Enzyme design. Sequence first.
Site, mmCIF file in Angstrom:
data_model
loop_
_atom_site.group_PDB
_atom_site.id
_atom_site.type_symbol
_atom_site.label_atom_id
_atom_site.label_comp_id
_atom_site.label_asym_id
_atom_site.label_seq_id
_atom_site.Cartn_x
_atom_site.Cartn_y
_atom_site.Cartn_z
ATOM 1 C CG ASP A 56 -6.619 -3.250 2.260
ATOM 2 O OD1 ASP A 56 -5.438 -3.700 2.431
ATOM 3 O OD2 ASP A 56 -7.553 -3.549 1.261
ATOM 4 C CB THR A 90 -2.728 1.541 -2.838
ATOM 5 O OG1 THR A 90 -3.406 1.079 -1.378
ATOM 6 C CG2 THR A 90 -3.155 3.132 -3.002
#
Lengths: 536, 107, 317
Positions: A56, A90
Amino acid sequence: EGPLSVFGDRSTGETIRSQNVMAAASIANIVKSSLGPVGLDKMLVDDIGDVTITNDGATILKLLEVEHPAAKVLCELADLQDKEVGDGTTSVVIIAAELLKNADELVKQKIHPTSVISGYRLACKEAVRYINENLIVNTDELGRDCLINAAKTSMSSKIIGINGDFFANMVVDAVLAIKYTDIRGQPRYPVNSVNILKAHGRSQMESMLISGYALNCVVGSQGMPKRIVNAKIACLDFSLQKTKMKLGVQVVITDPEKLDQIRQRESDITKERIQKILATGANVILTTGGIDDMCLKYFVEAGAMAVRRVLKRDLKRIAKASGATILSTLANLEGEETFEAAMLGQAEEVVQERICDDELILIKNTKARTSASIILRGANDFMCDEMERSLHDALCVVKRVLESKSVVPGGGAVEAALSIYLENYATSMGSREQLAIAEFARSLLVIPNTLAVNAAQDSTDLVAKLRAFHNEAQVNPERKNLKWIGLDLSNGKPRDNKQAGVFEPTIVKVKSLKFATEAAITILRIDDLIKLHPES
Amino acid sequence: DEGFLLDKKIGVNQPKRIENAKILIANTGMDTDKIKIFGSRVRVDSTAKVAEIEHAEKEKMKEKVERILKHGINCFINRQLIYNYPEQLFGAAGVMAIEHADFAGVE
Amino acid sequence: AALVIDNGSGMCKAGFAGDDAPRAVFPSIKDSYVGDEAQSKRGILTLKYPIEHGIVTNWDDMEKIWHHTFYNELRVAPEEHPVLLTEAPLNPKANREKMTQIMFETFNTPAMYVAIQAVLSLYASGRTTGIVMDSGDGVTHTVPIYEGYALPHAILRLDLAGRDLTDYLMKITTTAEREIVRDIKEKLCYVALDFEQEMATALFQPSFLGMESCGIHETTFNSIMKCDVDIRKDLYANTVLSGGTTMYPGIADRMQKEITALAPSTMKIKIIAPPERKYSVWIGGSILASLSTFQQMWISKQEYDESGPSIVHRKCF
Ligand SMILES: Nc1ncnc2c1ncn2[C@@H]1O[C@H](COP(=O)(O)OP(=O)(O)O)[C@@H](O)[C@H]1O
Ligand SMILES: [Mg+2]
């Protein structure tokens, strides 16, 4: 220094712009390796041996110890994406960093930063419009398998990837369980009401979806039963303990013969409250407060299950799910103290279940609403935490798919199409804003580039094929079905991702673009930096 | 300034403009004003009596405000604070109650 | 090893011997996993701290605390480790018998020892002889110590602690505003060698506050004068101060001056009060539990079984 005499350092001009771009690039290179089905996880060691494995991006950038402000900005960007969407944390960082890189390249060429910012803003607006008009798919046309495919796409790149075939079912079921309709009859899917517990032990495939609720609590006394079938549930927000007079009340004896009776009330008061509760039929009593041993004995003798120190949020969810009413006091509008059976909730079973040498409470088949819990089962606490984070991403994605019924294809399809469209669209807007919009377009390509790089494949060839397909789609009105083409990273070949099942919520990409654009604009406006020495 | 200027505040529900202003300048308590007997303490056997005594305190403050209003005023300036209840009373009476002026302000 | 539970009218500050820091500061010291690893602690989190003013009010509470400072915040067993508990100076015998009954009967500790907090404070500073002025939140104590033991006959007890100190400052009423006065007490409050030259540019004297008993320097002087005339040199020259109360004004030299005045013009008095390790009592306890003379001083479980409250009281009545 010198003429100013400020007690600090000062960076100015191309120097500070280069520094900002270096910082953003650093942050993006931290997370680039964790993008897509071929991305890999990261260890993080907290200077004490506390270990965290994760894919994550928001988590990674939260754990890092960043000093540069242009890098703190991207960390906050990932945090904001995680708060508002739940996926894309991301990609948004990578895109912001690439926009910064190309925009600084333009500013080096002496295009004014205002012009780069205007072009970036225009390109963001038009990319949002083009997505909303050409690249969306309605989940209604696809049914329920659209939700499963979106969940699997979100779970790809996580430690529940290949098992997605099954995890997505759970995720979908869980959101469907917590569905509730509000005023305006709009369906709301309030995730974070799905409870997620972790318990190392059995494999992932043994993770459990509980139609009901799971409590990280246990009964208060070993003499109490540990299973109840026709569970009548009483949710209390007060403690069941020996009664203590409040601050402004004092006991002052001047006739010893009264002392005994006073002491007796200190306990009998609480007894009466419990009797009232038990008089209604309540077999299960959850309380946010404590329960003295004296009280636990009453529950034991009644054949009830009492649970203390339950969490307020768990209590609110059990109440909403079972039909109970959280009471902070046994007090009515008639100036007396009673407990009505209407304040009770119901559930088809309450059990104390064993899970790898650690017990929890299971409330199964609640009426007045369906609730959902998920017990994740892995090999150790690190894996279980990564599974929790992955599942949170998947739940947020499914929620977004259900709120707005539009999805877009994955595998760099959206970025490729936008690159094509914006490199064609820049020709109309000014002369320098044209360069800015072309650079926005080219920057968008960092996503398929990174996906292919991580897959250990020829990024150049693959992204060129992608752009060729999407150009064919945008110049040949008979071939618009090519829009749905994106990367297949298990074979290194473009693929119809709408038919392959690689779906992402429109809000994911839209918010990624908007937030990345604002972050890049914010950082791209700095042309000076005054770093003061600390006051001490 | 042909008149005078004060860097203090007017109350909440109280007027903001006053013509032909009659002013009472004061140095009273008007702030949970307690009887200067310091050994005095409320010692009872029932919250009902505590509530009666609280109501009596409030009635004492109200009678103070009424004694003030019997001067026939529109502006009231206190060297000390003016708590919420007397502020409310002065507002209901249509009196501008300026609070926390200093010794210098009142002089 | 030896568990060193430092009650110190603070927090539990428990751990092991040899550790330079405690490992179990319970009062004012995971989730989403499975088991009872938060609820059991959530119960204790809101439980009132038994020790008030350096004296145990509720024993069931204290016992529940210790039990949760053994099984939860240490994850150990007391049935195999000796325990070093700490008590305030001039602590009633009854409290001693109660805690010794708890440890030996409930926790079944093989051996235990109860040490005076001022003695352990002196130990953490590295010395074994001297007079400790311990002024905390509720009590003030002067403990003369010779050969490492608190002479039980020269313990003078006066009462001018943080509360009594901030009182006059309040005088110069509401909780928040008396805590503004106490915030100033917590912050710099430099002790005045002479209040004359200190107020010119603007406990030692009972009249100041309103008391009529004695100053803290008078207290130290008389506690030194109720000891051996030979150890008098050591008491006068090894006065060690402790307590956040006495730290806040940083009183060293005003004391030193007026104690020198009181004492004969022979012994040179030096006060060592700069440590502030914020765990002095714990480190003193750890030093003691590390020594072998602690094994010597052990009130053993067999000793307890054979004597009871008499063994806790060490006979000599
Ligand atoms: N199965 C798949 N095939 C092709 N592309 C995918 C697949 N799954 C995800 N992607 C792409 O990878 C990008 C990032 O995915 P991921 O790293 O899991 O989420 P995040 O970027 O939030 O960390 C997405 O933009 C998506 O287009
Ligand atoms: Mg994702």
